[PDB]
Amino acid sequence: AFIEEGTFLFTSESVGEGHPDKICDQISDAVLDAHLQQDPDAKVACETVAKTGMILLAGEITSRAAVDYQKVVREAVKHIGYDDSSKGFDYKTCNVLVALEQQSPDIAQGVHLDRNEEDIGAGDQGLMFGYATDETEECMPLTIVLAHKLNAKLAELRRNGTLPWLRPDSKTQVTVQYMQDRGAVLPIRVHTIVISVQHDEEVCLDEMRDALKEKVIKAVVPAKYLDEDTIYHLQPSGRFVIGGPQGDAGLTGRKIIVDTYGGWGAHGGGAFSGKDYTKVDRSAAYAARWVAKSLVKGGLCRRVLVQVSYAIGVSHPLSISIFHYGTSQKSERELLEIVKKNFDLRPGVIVRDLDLKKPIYQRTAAYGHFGRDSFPWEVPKKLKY
Amino acid sequence: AFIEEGTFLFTSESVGEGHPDKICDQISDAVLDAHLQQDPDAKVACETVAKTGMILLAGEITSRAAVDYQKVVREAVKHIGYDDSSKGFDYKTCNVLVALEQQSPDIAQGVHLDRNEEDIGAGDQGLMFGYATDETEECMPLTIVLAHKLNAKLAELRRNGTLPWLRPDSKTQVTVQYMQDRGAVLPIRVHTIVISVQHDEEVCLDEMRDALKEKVIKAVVPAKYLDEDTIYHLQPSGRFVIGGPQGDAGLTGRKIIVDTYGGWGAHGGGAFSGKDYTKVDRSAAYAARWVAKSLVKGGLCRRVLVQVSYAIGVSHPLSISIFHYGTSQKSERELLEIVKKNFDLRPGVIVRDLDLKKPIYQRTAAYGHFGRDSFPWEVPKKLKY
Ligand SMILES: COc1ccc(-n2cc3cnc(NCC(F)(F)F)nc3c(-c3ccc(Br)cc3)c2=O)cc1
Ligand SMILES: COc1ccc(-n2cc3cnc(NCC(F)(F)F)nc3c(-c3ccc(Br)cc3)c2=O)cc1
Ligand SMILES: C[S@@+](CC[C@H](N)C(=O)[O-])C[C@H]1O[C@@H](n2cnc3c(N)ncnc32)[C@H](O)[C@@H]1O
Ligand SMILES: C[S@@+](CC[C@H](N)C(=O)[O-])C[C@H]1O[C@@H](n2cnc3c(N)ncnc32)[C@H](O)[C@@H]1O
Ligand SMILES: [Cl-]
Ligand SMILES: [Cl-]
Ligand SMILES: [Mg+2]
Ligand SMILES: [Mg+2]
Ligand SMILES: [Mg+2]
Ligand SMILES: [Mg+2]
Ligand SMILES: [Mg+2]
Numbered sequence: 001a002f003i004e005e006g007t008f009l010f011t012s013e014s015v016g017e018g019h020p021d022k023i024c025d026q027i028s029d030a031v032l033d034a035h036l037q038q039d040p041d042a043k044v045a046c047e048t049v050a051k052t053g054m055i056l057l058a059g060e061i062t063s064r065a066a067v068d069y070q071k072v073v074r075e076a077v078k079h080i081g082y083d084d085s086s087k088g089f090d091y092k093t094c095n096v097l098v099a100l101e102q103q104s105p106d107i108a109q110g111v112h113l114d115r116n117e118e119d120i121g122a123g124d125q126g127l128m129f130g131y132a133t134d135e136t137e138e139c140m141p142l143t144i145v146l147a148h149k150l151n152a153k154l155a156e157l158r159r160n161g162t163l164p165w166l167r168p169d170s171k172t173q174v175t176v177q178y179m180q181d182r183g184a185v186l187p188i189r190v191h192t193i194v195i196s197v198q199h200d201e202e203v204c205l206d207e208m209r210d211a212l213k214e215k216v217i218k219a220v221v222p223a224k225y226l227d228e229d230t231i232y233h234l235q236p237s238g239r240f241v242i243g244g245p246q247g248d249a250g251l252t253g254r255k256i257i258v259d260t261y262g263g264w265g266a267h268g269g270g271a272f273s274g275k276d277y278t279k280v281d282r283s284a285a286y287a288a289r290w291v292a293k294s295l296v297k298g299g300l301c302r303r304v305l306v307q308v309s310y311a312i313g314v315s316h317p318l319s320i321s322i323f324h325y326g327t328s329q330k331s332e333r334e335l336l337e338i339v340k341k342n343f344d345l346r347p348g349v350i351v352r353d354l355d356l357k358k359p360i361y362q363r364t365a366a367y368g369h370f371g372r373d374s375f376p377w378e379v380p381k382k383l384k385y
Numbered sequence: 386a387f388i389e390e391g392t393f394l395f396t397s398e399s400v401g402e403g404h405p406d407k408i409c410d411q412i413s414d415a416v417l418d419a420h421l422q423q424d425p426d427a428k429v430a431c432e433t434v435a436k437t438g439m440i441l442l443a444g445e446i447t448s449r450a451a452v453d454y455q456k457v458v459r460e461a462v463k464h465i466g467y468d469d470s471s472k473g474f475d476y477k478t479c480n481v482l483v484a485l486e487q488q489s490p491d492i493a494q495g496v497h498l499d500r501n502e503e504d505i506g507a508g509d510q511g512l513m514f515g516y517a518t519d520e521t522e523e524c525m526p527l528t529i530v531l532a533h534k535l536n537a538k539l540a541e542l543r544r545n546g547t548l549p550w551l552r553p554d555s556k557t558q559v560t561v562q563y564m565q566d567r568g569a570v571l572p573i574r575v576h577t578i579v580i581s582v583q584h585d586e587e588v589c590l591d592e593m594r595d596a597l598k599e600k601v602i603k604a605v606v607p608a609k610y611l612d613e614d615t616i617y618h619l620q621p622s623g624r625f626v627i628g629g630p631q632g633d634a635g636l637t638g639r640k641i642i643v644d645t646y647g648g649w650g651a652h653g654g655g656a657f658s659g660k661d662y663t664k665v666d667r668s669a670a671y672a673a674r675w676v677a678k679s680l681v682k683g684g685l686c687r688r689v690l691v692q693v694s695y696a697i698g699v700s701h702p703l704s705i706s707i708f709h710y711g712t713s714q715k716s717e718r719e720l721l722e723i724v725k726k727n728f729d730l731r732p733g734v735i736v737r738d739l740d741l742k743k744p745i746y747q748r749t750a751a752y753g754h755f756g757r758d759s760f761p762w763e764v765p766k767k768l769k770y
Binding site (some may be wrong): 003005008009010011012013045047049050051052054056059060086088094101104105106107109110111113121125126129171173175191192196231233236237238239240242246247248249251252253254255256258263264266267268269292307309311312313314318319321322323331332333336 | 388393397431436441471489506510523555558579618627632648653656679697699703721
């Protein structure tokens with residue numbers, strides 16, 4: 001397809017609830033939630049690893065909670081849908097191994113011991129970005145929104161029994177052509193869609209490809225974006241019976257771009273799942289999203305990127321910067337002043353503003369952390385200036 | 386510090402060879418190299434997990450090689466410097482566990498079985514970006530270059546015995562103020578430096594902070610970038626005796642931004658280490674770097690971002706796009722035509738151009754994959770147009 005000057009292509013991907021990396025993210029956040037339900041101040045850094053027959057928890061937790069890891073892990077796998085050896089993985093019969101220790105006392109003393117909550121230090125150094133774009137109501141890139149919705153539709157049709165050959169492991173990828181608009185972007189058309197999904201031994205390739213087009217793509221992607229030139233790669237490997245952890249090892253924090261903006265904006269490298277609010281990889285990224293979305297919904301920008309960074313043990317961010325892509329009449333200095341007057345990005349203040357001791361994290365761990373369900377970081381702050 | 390209009394701050398981080406995530410990347414690539422030394426066509430997808438006393442290998446390998454995983458893992462840990470219980474980890478006495486299976490036959494049949502090498506399919510779907518910037522000779526952002534060099538200097542002074550209290554686990558972070566220059570960027574000054582490094586029980590905080598400034602920062606960062614306003618956070622946690630996997634679990638592919646551009650450019654989410662060339666997460670990212678660097682060294686751009694993407698089982702990229710930040714006199718269409726005429730981004734052609742069956746991967750797995758050592762993707766292609 002021809003690319004008119006002033007237009008361009010961009011691609012993002014998403015994965016389903018049973019993708020092995022996403023299994024790990026969901027388990028790590030189920031463990032976090034289980035701790036927070038009993039101890040709102042639990043210090044949690046839980047990594048999960050998945051391979052054939054195995055969930056391993058590894059990391060550091062200091063908490064007053066009494067958590068039954070066997071039950072928490074197995075219930076999370078059950079929810080995903082891995083409930084029989086015929087599907088490659090079974091919550092009832094898999095191995096759950098635990099290698100969890102207390103948080104390092106050296107970290108604890110440098111971050112939170114004997115500190116006023118508002119003045120707790122960042123739990124690590126790092127950099128984080130927030131992004132928002134007015135191209136969708138939820139202020140997310142269309143590429144990633146569509147990719148997530150394709151995976152959600154697969155899970156829906158698996159769970160409602162209308163495509164009973166589906167299994168839980170899936171991946172999708174969407175390329176959209178955009179029009180430049182004074183620094184903002186406007187979606188024009190869908191250029192290419194990829195869908196791969198684990199399936200039973202009985203269904204044939206043609207039946208699957210027809211269903212993926214008619215029952216999945218057409219039920220998700222508006223027809224105005226699809227044309228005779230759109231390219232479809234549906235079950236492009238030809239066979240995907242082996243899947244889940246049996247097909248590919250999973251680890252927590254290996255889908256960080258799926259979790260955020262689908263490649264748009266920028267990313268500082270930190271993973272979200274399995275971490276309590278003192279880990280700024282999560283809390284500061286959520287707050288940076290909240291700032292970005294507040295700037296767009298407040299009418300100050302159409303598209304905006306925010307970078308923050310921290311040093312371990314230091315509460316205030318080391319610096320904050322705002323880039324508006326040419327979509328604000330205010331200068332970068334002016335936007336920064338507005339942000340500094342309206343937000344306090346210490347982790348011990350973010351926790352209060354975004355209610356980050358609440359056990360809602362398992363809900364964040366599939367289909368992206370941003371752009372859905374009116375989580376606190378998705379509710380814009382009314383800005384004073 | 387005041388930010389003049391037309392200037393801005395940007396932050397990147399790096400980690401040392403003994404950071405637990407980086408340990409895992411290095412082990413995963415040591416395993417890959419060991420296979421490639423005997424079987425250049427080995428199919429390798431090796432994840433590593435590290436916690437107190439434990440290295441676990443998990444993933445999928447199909448290979449004609451006979452690899453002694455105990456020896457390969459322990460020699461990699463020895464090289465890093467974890468050789469005694471007093472340091473928190475010891476290659477001689479740790480547990481090495483292996484959960485490695487063959488590559489899924491369903492993947493194999495859809496990717497490479499009975500396919501001409503040049504026509505092998507991508508080993509997965511995904512998106513990848515390449516980036517280059519003329520702000521340094523090696524065409525990398527100064528923020529990340531400096532951050533890497535600070536970690537390398539720590540390892541040097543540990544190994545040469547002049548700072549014998551140092552241990553292998555470290556992290557660094559550098560914020561630079563830049564001047565905008567017609568889409569390119571020009572470094573002005575270093576705004577903030579963070580250094581945290583594991584240390585012995587005997588050395589005091591003041592001795593460490595003085596050494597980190599005088600022997601590390603001053604030996605790495607040109608004095609012209611440092612002034613009386615530069616902020617230093619040196620050992621900001623106050624105590625870092627517990628470190629390595631004992632302090633924090635490590636996993637392969639959890640430092641993907643450290644491995645690439647330090648937050649500049651863009652990232653598609655895929656990890657590099659532990660993967661052979663058929664995994665486009667690695668090979669196509671390397672090729673995209675090669676394209677970007679070729680465009681800058683060829684005088685066509687000063688700063689450039691390239692996105693490619695793939696579907697599993699399909700050899701050619703689904704699309705390619707080039708963004709030059711306003712730093713080329715050529716249009717995006719023209720640059721794309723030049724790229725298409727000069728490069729072939731099928732994985733089975735990338736392998737030949739970049740010599741990706743060679744066992745050099747362990748060398749890539751610390752201090753970034755880009756900007757050093759004249760690896761094949763760092764040697765620009767002479768462009769014809
Ligand atoms: C005057 O209004 C505008 C509005 C938007 C743009 N604009 C144009 C682009 C063209 N082509 C690519 N290719 C993707 C690439 F990865 F290959 F670069 N990207 C672009 C981007 C972009 C850059 C980085 C990221 Br992250 C995400 C999008 C872009 O903002 C220009 C002028
Ligand atoms: C006319 O010449 C130029 C030359 C460069 C720029 N330019 C300016 C920026 C200002 N401020 C931030 N803050 C970091 C932020 F994360 F908060 F946005 N970034 C910027 C960037 C930028 C954007 C995304 C990424 Br990735 C990396 C750098 C930038 O290119 C503008 C005009
Ligand atoms: C292709 S596998 C990664 C490569 C792999 N580790 C190997 O050994 O070659 C990555 C993801 O793709 C999906 N996948 C697994 N088997 C597949 C298949 N046969 N066809 C298509 N996608 C598959 C799963 O979501 C999986 O987590
Ligand atoms: C701070 S730890 C991550 C948080 C952690 N998992 C916990 O339980 O709170 C992340 C990295 O910081 C470094 N680190 C570990 N202990 C530290 C300490 N006491 N002071 C500073 N940095 C430390 C190591 O490089 C480690 O991999
Ligand atoms: Cl994957
Ligand atoms: Cl880390
Ligand atoms: Mg953590
Ligand atoms: Mg963007
Ligand atoms: Mg940009
Ligand atoms: Mg792989
Ligand atoms: Mg950039």
